[PDB]
Ligand binder design. Structure first.
Ligand SMILES: CCCCCCCCCCCCCCCCCC(=O)OC[C@H](COP(=O)([O-])OCC(O)COP(=O)([O-])OC[C@@H](COC(=O)CCCCCCCCCCCCCCCCC)OC(=O)CCCCCCCCCCCCCCCCC)OC(=O)CCCCCCCCCCCCCCCCC
Ligand SMILES: CCCCCCCCCCCCCCCCCC(=O)OC[C@H](COP(=O)([O-])OCC(O)COP(=O)([O-])OC[C@@H](COC(=O)CCCCCCCCCCCCCCCCC)OC(=O)CCCCCCCCCCCCCCCCC)OC(=O)CCCCCCCCCCCCCCCCC
Ligand SMILES: CCCCCCCCCCCCCCCCCC(=O)OC[C@H](COP(=O)([O-])OCC(O)COP(=O)([O-])OC[C@@H](COC(=O)CCCCCCCCCCCCCCCCC)OC(=O)CCCCCCCCCCCCCCCCC)OC(=O)CCCCCCCCCCCCCCCCC
Ligand SMILES: CCCCCCCCCCCCCCCCCC(=O)OC[C@H](COP(=O)([O-])OCC(O)COP(=O)([O-])OC[C@@H](COC(=O)CCCCCCCCCCCCCCCCC)OC(=O)CCCCCCCCCCCCCCCCC)OC(=O)CCCCCCCCCCCCCCCCC
Ligand SMILES: CCCCCCCCCCCCCCCCCC(=O)OC[C@H](COP(=O)([O-])OCC[N+](C)(C)C)OC(=O)CCCCCCCCCCCCCCCCC
Ligand SMILES: CCCCCCCCCCCCCCCCC[C@@H](O)O[C@H](CO[C@H](O)CCCCCCCCCCCCCCC)COP(=O)(O)OCC[N+](C)(C)C
Ligand SMILES: CCCCCCCC/C=C\CCCCCCCC(=O)OC[C@H](COP(=O)(O)OCCN)OC(=O)CCCCCCC/C=C\CCCCCCCC
Ligand SMILES: CCCCCCCCCCCCCCCCCC(=O)OC[C@H](COP(=O)(O)OCCN)OC(=O)CCCCCCCCCCCCCCCCC
Lengths: 140, 54, 115, 174, 49, 54, 98, 347, 121
């Protein structure tokens, strides 16, 4: 987890779009694997083949979302020549939301996911820029 | 009155949020109460905590 | 080392006796000879069906009292201490609590088998 | 060296793999008895004869009750054994393969697990040169439960008495 | 006699009433004395009066 | 000409096994009033033994 | 750390994974629970005997005592469940839901 | 159960918790946990029925697993330090095991399912004792070992607890399961503040215990275990419904009630440590708890549901047993906001 | 735990000896009056729950409620004041002992400080 995030962040912002897409795809695949493992544990499938099918579907959905987000964000940053701009991450997040909507075959899910993932990704970019921290170290 | 106030402004914030919360509530609370299932969940949690937390 | 050799010798002798028993004599086996024994007639049920245990509570009490005696076993070495009064007090305390457990179960009818 | 402690530890892990693959409580108890005896051997080699014999005796007594309970409560028409079931055999083989892999890696190189760092060397190496005289340190430390450890005796005896009360109360019914 | 059955709290429980009043009075006088002692000790320690 | 107060339809919408029923949760049923489930007609199945003739 | 400690910790992990993965019987999970405390006993006594912590030699005995209390508690619950349902299967403990 | 045996079992539960709280030795802390569990099982099984037996079985399995993991952590810590004293743990793996075990004992997510299941299984008195006291002990251990807690693991489990509690409570319609999910959310808040100010953890614990005692005792007084059962209480004793409504408003965190004080202090304390996203998400997620508290308040006090015909006989009769300290719990859970700076006395 | 384990702390002591040098709360403290008000509210709620006349019945019981709340509030206020005095004492001592960490800065007037002007139009 931390190693994957370190790789993704160590690739520079506006360069190496293929490596950025690979790293984001790996992160998405790991997230999908975790979600699928919890789904298998909590809602058991009727068969081993059904379990494998569900795991593959969730993993591919997450990996596709990650790949689309990373590729779109890096390409947008490259073409605009404006790294460190939250708009690139917003575009990547909405592209990932559209990918989720396509995977689920639902326009409403696609639209809501585009909005929410775009806001989340833009906020993550702003946090990287401004030094925001979620799990802050204790002090004071 | 109709398209914006009664339909779209209602759909964007309060209706969509309520629908998402209801769906997540159903997902969380829809359990059969099987110790086998949620102990397997415990095992997955323990492995994840040991590996991905350093 | 010597104890391992002794255990190996005993196990090997017993296994050799089993091997001689199962390979020396003439064998004739058929389905009627190897059928289960129930006094000349066929068994109605199976021997793997549940078998009620009328002393299930005495077994649990046995677990607890067995670990009580595990606590009591190191007493011979405890008698070499300088704190003889404290040692004697704690030994008698453990034994009195064991007696209290026995008395409680006896009066509350835990020692009676289920009917 | 003779690797006696390592061999015994491997047998200990094998018995755990057995009763954790969980064929049926009869064979689970058999594997647990084997593991208890082997652990008695391990701690006998390390020095504690009283502790080894005590844990062996306690588990022999405990598994005797489990046999009677599985005859009454946890039995079926065809009790499962390790080769009888696909799941049980799969889990048993998985555990054996994992133990073999880790043993081989540790013997071939100083294996650092994702949790702890282990060095492949002598259990005889790790021992201490010094000796006692005319008494057993383990026996004296255990016998110190009555001179020292007055508080431990009190809480332990209270817990045992309340345990008798509890088992009587749980099985009351009505 | 309105009630066919004697109410549990028909008559005051004089023991409880006396204990209540005594406890309240004791707490009040103890609080007054404690405050007076606290003021005196504070003044003595700080060298005021 | 008076304030509206809930009726049987309202109460019954609040009286299910769970809020927001689904297929599974509609197959679910609310627990008994005194929390005591009716006894199950399990079979004792006493052991049958041939005592004799040999 | 010697390989003996590695094997004992591995045995504990195996017994923990056995408990968390029920099959049908409650008794098998109880046996997995008893194995975990056996591995804890062995690990504790190996650590204590190696370091000559003399006063800590009584700790494994207390560990065994409370293992016995847990086993007694579990067997009592098992007999109650079996009386109610006819079998010690864990599938019958489904009246309560999350 | 004999009254003497019941009171000796209650005293044994309390003695185990007190041993945990006063011990300085990890073995004695483990002994206290074991004694607490052993005496706590019959209390759950006090009223014998299959649901109580199942709840006691699930509680025993979960607590035995947690105690085993805790002892493994203790032994691993002893291996790398030779120390039995409860201080900062010297091994990160042992600390992770200890955190997992204590979280499983407390019911923090993803170790929460047993909380609603067991609480629905057991009676109202048993649920009251369970929630209150069995949260009281592990939190004291966590406060003792707070300086080595992994902030990431602790805060992840806390946010999971808040989210899961809100959502489960949204779905539930049984009062005991509602209480259990509310408990999960409040434990989330306390353990979220835990790595920064154990004083704020203690303050939240006390306020939560007061509100939970008042709520459970009101349910016991009204003999209501479902929403529709509680909907008949306005026609028997309308005062109890009003007090319950004010207590529910307090639990939801509305100012100026006593439920606002812990959330306020925790948000402030976390903000001092440069945490903003976490307090904002935690504050926004509590709206779910407030929603299902308000849904419960609509049915019982703010609207008048249909009643039955035997309520007339119930009118003719009077409640006999008197709840101990119910008025005090009602007042402390609603009206002590102007007394906030006493948390320094709590320090 | 900030002040837990502060040197010289006696365990399980609600009020130490060094707290006697602080001014005790006045008996007419507004916080004490609010504690008495909480006691009175508890008494009224007791009467209401037990279905006695709320304001009239149980005057002795209501007096006991108010008195208990005032008593405990007095001692709680003393402990709270002591803890705050202790905190200020420690903070001042640390600032005195670490001058390099808490330096006095030269004061500049607004005639010397330059601030950017942002017109509102
Ligand atoms: C802490 C310590 C941790 C461990 C540390 C190591 C030490 C221990 C080592 C082991 C020693 C022995 C102890 C273990 C004892 C096990 C035990 O008792 O199990 C009983 C338990 C239940 O027994 P049972 O009830 O009699 O069996 C009922 C039948 O299974 C009924 O059959 P069925 O018709 O219902 O279907 C069969 C099967 C159907 O199975 C399925 O549906 C599962 C399909 C999974 C497919 C995975 C594909 C992806 C693989 C990884 C990624 C690859 C890269 C590419 C990306 C992905 C592409 C897809 O199972 C089910 O349907 C039941 C559902 C619940 C269990 C599912 C399996 C485990 C879930 C948790 C992990 C999920 C992983 C998901 C993937 C993500 C991985 C990151 O058995 C099992 O769970 C399976 C057999 C045992 C396997 C054990 C293997 C070792 C585990 C450790
Ligand atoms: C205080 C004020 C605050 C603000 C107030 C206002 C708040 C917001 C108001 C509402 C705006 C947001 C609406 C969200 C989208 C709808 C969500 C939803 O659940 O839709 C279900 C609904 C489908 O429902 P379903 O039952 O799942 O599928 C059955 C349909 O029959 C399946 O459809 P079909 O097969 O019959 O054909 C549909 C086809 C029909 O084709 C189109 O709609 C293409 C329209 C192209 C533009 C035409 C106008 C040209 C001039 C535009 C303005 C120029 C100046 C600027 O559209 C598509 O295929 C969409 C795919 C993407 C096409 C690219 C353009 C988008 O989705 C749509 O119909 C999508 C239409 C989206 C149109 C654009 C909406 C605005 C986008 C965001 C702007 C910011
Ligand atoms: C949600 C909606 C609202 C969202 C609000 C916006 C939040 C923006 C925050 C962005 C930010 O400043 O991130 C910090 C951080 C600032 O840089 P830094 O100073 O290097 O700090 C990171 C250190 O290297 C290393 O820092 P660290 O090791 O102290 O911690 C970093 C943290 C990983 O950092 C983060 O998670 C934050 C950055 C990515 C967040 C992406 C989604 C936004 C989620 C925001 C709300 C989080 C709530 C968590 C609740 C958990 C339970 C549900 O990783 C861990 O703590 C490892 C163990 C736990 C992992 C999480 C496991 C459970 C996850 C369950 C939910 C999924 O961002 C990054 O490093 C970004 C790296 C690339 C990320 C992917 C692009
Ligand atoms: C310190 C000792 C350490 C030992 C190592 C560690 C042990 C840890 C615990 C156990 C862990 C797993 C052990 C291996 C399991 C293998 C998998 C399996 O299911 O095997 C089949 C077999 C189950 O078959 P079954 O249902 O009994 O027989 C019906 C046939 O399947 C029906 O098929 P069939 O009739 O066509 O097949 C007939 C054939 C079937 O033969 C076998 O299955 C032989 C299996 C030998 C496994 C030895 C390991 O039997 C024969 O020909 C009769 C002679 C062979 C059996 C008697 C001698 C066995 C070796 C002793 O497994 C067992 O019975 C397990 C026995 C394990 C004994 C271990 C040593 C016990 C020592 C007790 C005292 C301890 C004192 C304290 C120290
Ligand atoms: C006291 C405890 C330990 C006991 C150890 C052994 C004690 C007995 C020692 C003397 C045994 C004498 C041989 C008896 C063999 C069985 C007879 C039998 O089956 O006959 C029918 C069968 C008849 O065979 P058949 O071919 O005619 O029959 C065909 C089958 N039917 C019947 C259907 C037609 O006899 C044989 O097969 C003869 C086999 C060879 C006999 C001699 C070999 C053994 C020699 C033993 C020497 C001692 C050392 C080795 C033995 C082990 C001890 C160390
Ligand atoms: C008859 C008159 C009325 C009596 C009513 C009594 C009801 C209350 C019972 C008294 C409770 C306090 C017991 C007083 C004697 C015990 C002394 C000891 O416990 O006091 C200190 C500790 O006491 C308590 O911690 C603080 C007592 C104050 C708690 C009540 C106020 C809580 C704040 C709530 C603010 C808003 C509500 C305002 C009140 C209405 C000791 O410190 P220490 O041993 O080292 O603590 C170690 C653990 N730490 C460090 C982590 C804390
Ligand atoms: C920020 C607030 C302002 C933006 C609000 C976003 C709303 C944009 C348009 C939503 C309208 C779409 C809609 O009507 O339904 C919502 C529609 C509901 O699903 P359906 O039942 O399939 O569709 C219903 C038929 N329409 O979308 C959803 O709410 C589900 C969204 C899926 C998950 C959202 C992704 C969240 C990921 C980010 C989390 C951090
Ligand atoms: C009957 C129902 C219950 C109400 C009982 C109220 C009892 C109050 C009197 C207590 C005994 C009087 C006493 O000891 O007084 C001494 C002291 C006076 O204050 P002191 O500091 O000496 O004054 C100097 C500056 N004026 O007294 C004090 O300092 C006491 C002040 C502390 C706070 C007391 C409680 C405040 C009131 C709460 C509401 C109770 C009254 C409600 C009345 C309703 C009537 C319908």
């Amino acid at each position: 987890a931390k190693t994957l995030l370190h790789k993704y962040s160590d690739i520079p912002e506006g360069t190496e779009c293929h490596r950025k897409a690979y790293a984001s795809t790996s992160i998405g695949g790991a997230t999908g694997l975790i979600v699928s493992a919890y789904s298998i544990a909590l809602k058991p499938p009727a068969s081993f083949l059904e379990g494998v099918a569900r795991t593959g579907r969730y993993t591919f959905t997450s990996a596709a979302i990650g790949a689309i987000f990373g590729l779109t964000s890096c390409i947008s940053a490259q073409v605009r020549e404006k790294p460190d701009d939250p708009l690139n991450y917003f575009i990547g997040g909405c592209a990932g939301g559209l990918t989720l909507g396509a995977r689920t075959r639902s326009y409403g899910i696609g639209a809501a996911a585009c909005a929410y993932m775009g806001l989340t990704a833009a906020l993550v970019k702003m946090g990287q820029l401004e030094g925001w921290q979620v799990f802050a170290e204790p002090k004071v | 009155s109709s398209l914006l106030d009664l339909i779209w402004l209602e759909t964007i914030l309060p209706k969509t949020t309520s629908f998402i919360q209801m769906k997540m509530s159903i997902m969380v609370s829809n359990q059969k109460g099987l110790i086998k299932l949620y102990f397997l969940s415990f095992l997955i949690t323990i492995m994840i905590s040991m590996t991905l937390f350093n | 080392m010597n104890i391992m050799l002794t255990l190996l010798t005993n196990v090997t002798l017993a296994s050799l006796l089993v091997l001689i028993a199962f390979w020396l004599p003439q064998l004739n086996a058929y389905s009627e000879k190897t059928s289960p024994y129930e006094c000349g007639f066929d068994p109605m049920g199976s021997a793997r069906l549940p078998f009620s245990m009328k002393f299930f509570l005495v077994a649990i009490t046995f677990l607890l009292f067995d670990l009580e005696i595990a606590l009591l076993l190191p007493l011979p070495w405890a008698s070499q201490t300088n704190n003889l009064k404290t040692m004697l007090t704690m030994a008698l305390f453990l034994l009195i609590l064991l007696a209290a457990s026995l008395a409680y179960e006896w009066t509350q009818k835990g020692l009676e088998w289920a009917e | 060296t003779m690797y006696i402690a390592f061999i015994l530890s491997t047998i200990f892990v094998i018995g755990f793999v057995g009763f954790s693959s969980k064929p049926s409580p009869i064979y689970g108890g058999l594997g647990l008895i084997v593991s208890g005896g082997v652990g008695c051997g391990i701690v006998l080699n390390f020095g504690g004869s009283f502790l080894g014999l005590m844990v062996f005796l306690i588990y022999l007594g405990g598994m005797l009750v489990v046999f009677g309970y599985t005859t009454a409560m946890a039995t079926e028409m065809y009790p499962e054994v390790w080769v009888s079931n696909k799941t049980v055999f799969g889990a048993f083989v998985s555990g054996l393969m994992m133990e073999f892999c880790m043993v081989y890696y540790a013997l071939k190189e100083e294996e650092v697990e994702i949790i702890f760092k282990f060095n492949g060397l002598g259990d005889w190496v790790i021992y201490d040169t010094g000796d006692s005289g005319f008494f057993s340190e383990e026996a004296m430390g255990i016998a110190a439960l009555y001179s020292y450890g007055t508080w431990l005796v009190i809480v332990t005896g209270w817990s045992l008495l309340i345990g008798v009360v509890v088992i009587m109360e749980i099985t009351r019914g009505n | 006699k309105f009630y066919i059955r004697e109410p549990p709290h028909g008559s005051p429980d004089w023991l409880k009433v006396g204990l209540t009043l005594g406890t309240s009075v004791f707490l009040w006088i103890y609080l007054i004395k404690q405050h007076k002692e606290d003021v005196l000790e504070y003044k003595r320690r700080n060298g005021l009066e | 000409a008076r304030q509206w107060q809930p009726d049987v339809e309202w109460a019954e919408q609040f009286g299910g096994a769970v809020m927001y029923p689904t297929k599974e949760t509609a197959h679910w049923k609310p627990p008994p009033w005194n929390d005591v489930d009716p006894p199950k007609d399990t079979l004792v199945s006493n052991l049958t033994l041939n005592f004799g003739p040999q | 750390m010697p390989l003996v400690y590695m094997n004992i910790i591995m045995a504990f992990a195996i017994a923990l994974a056995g408990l968390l993965m029920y099959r049908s019987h409650l008794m098998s999970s109880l046996l997995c629970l008893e194995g975990m405390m056996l591995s804890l006993f062995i690990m504790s006594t190996l650590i204590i005997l190696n370091t000559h912590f003399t006063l800590a030699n009584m700790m494994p005995i207390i560990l065994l005592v409370f293992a016995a209390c847990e086993a007694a508690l579990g067997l009592s619950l098992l007999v109650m469940v079996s009386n109610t349902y006819g079998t010690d299967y864990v599938q019958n403990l489904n009246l309560l839901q999350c | 159960m004999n009254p003497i045996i019941y009171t000796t079992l209650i005293m044994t539960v309390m003695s185990g918790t007190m041993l945990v709280m006063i011990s300085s030795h990890w073995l004695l802390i483990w002994i206290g946990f074991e004694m607490n569990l052993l005496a706590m099982i019959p209390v759950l099984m006090k009223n014998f029925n299959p649901r109580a037996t199942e709840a006691a079985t699930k509680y025993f399995l979960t607590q035995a697993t947690a105690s085993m993991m805790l002892m493994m952590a203790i032994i691993i810590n002893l291996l790398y330090s030779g120390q039995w004293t409860i201080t900062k743990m010297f091994n990160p793996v042992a600390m992770t095991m200890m955190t997992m075990a204590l979280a499983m004992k407390l019911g923090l997510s993803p170790f929460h399912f047993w909380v609603p299941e067991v609480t629905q299984g057991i009676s109202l008195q048993a649920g009251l004792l369970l929630l209150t006291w069995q949260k009281l002990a592990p939190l004291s251990v966590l406060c003792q070992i707070s300086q080595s807690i992994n902030p990431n693991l602790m805060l992840t489990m806390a946010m999971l607890s808040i989210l899961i509690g809100g959502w489960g409570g949204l779905n539930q319609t049984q009062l005991r399961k509602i209480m259990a999910y509310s408990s999960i959310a409040h434990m989330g808040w306390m353990t979220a503040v835990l790595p920064y100010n154990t004083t704020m953890t203690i303050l939240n614990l006390l306020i939560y215990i007061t509100m939970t005692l008042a709520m459970f005792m009101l349910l016991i007084h009204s003999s209501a275990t479902t929403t529709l059962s509680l909907s008949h209480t306005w026609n028997k004793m309308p005062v109890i419904t009003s007090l319950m409504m004010v207590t529910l408003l307090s639990m939801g965190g509305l100012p100026p009630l006593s439920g606002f004080m812990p959330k306020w202090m925790i948000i402030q304390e976390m903000t001092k440590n440069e945490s903003i996203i976490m307090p904002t998400l935690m504050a926004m997620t509590a709206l779910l708890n407030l929603y299902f508290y308000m849904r419960l308040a609509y049915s019982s006090s703010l609207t008048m549901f249909p009643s039955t015909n035997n309520m007339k006989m119930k009118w003719q009769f009077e409640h006999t047993k008197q709840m101990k300290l119910l008025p005090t719990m009602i007042v402390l859970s609603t009206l002590v906001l102007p007394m906030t700076p006493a948390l320094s006395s709590l320090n | 735990t900030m002040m837990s384990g502060r040197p010289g702390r006696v365990p399980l002591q609600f009020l130490p000896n060094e707290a006697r040098s602080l001014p005790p709360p006045k008996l007419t403290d507004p916080r004490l009056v609010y504690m008495g008000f909480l006691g009175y509210c508890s008494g009224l709620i007791d009467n209401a729950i037990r279905r006695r006349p709320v304001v009239s019945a149980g005057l002795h019981r209501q007096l006991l409620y108010v008195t208990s709340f005032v008593f405990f509030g007095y001692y709680l206020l003393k402990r709270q004041d002591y803890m705050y005095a202790l905190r200020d004492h420690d903070m001042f001592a640390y600032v005195k002992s670490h001058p390099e960490d808490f330096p006095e800065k030269d004061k500049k007037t607004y005639g010397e400080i330059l601030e950017e002007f942002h017109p509102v139009r």
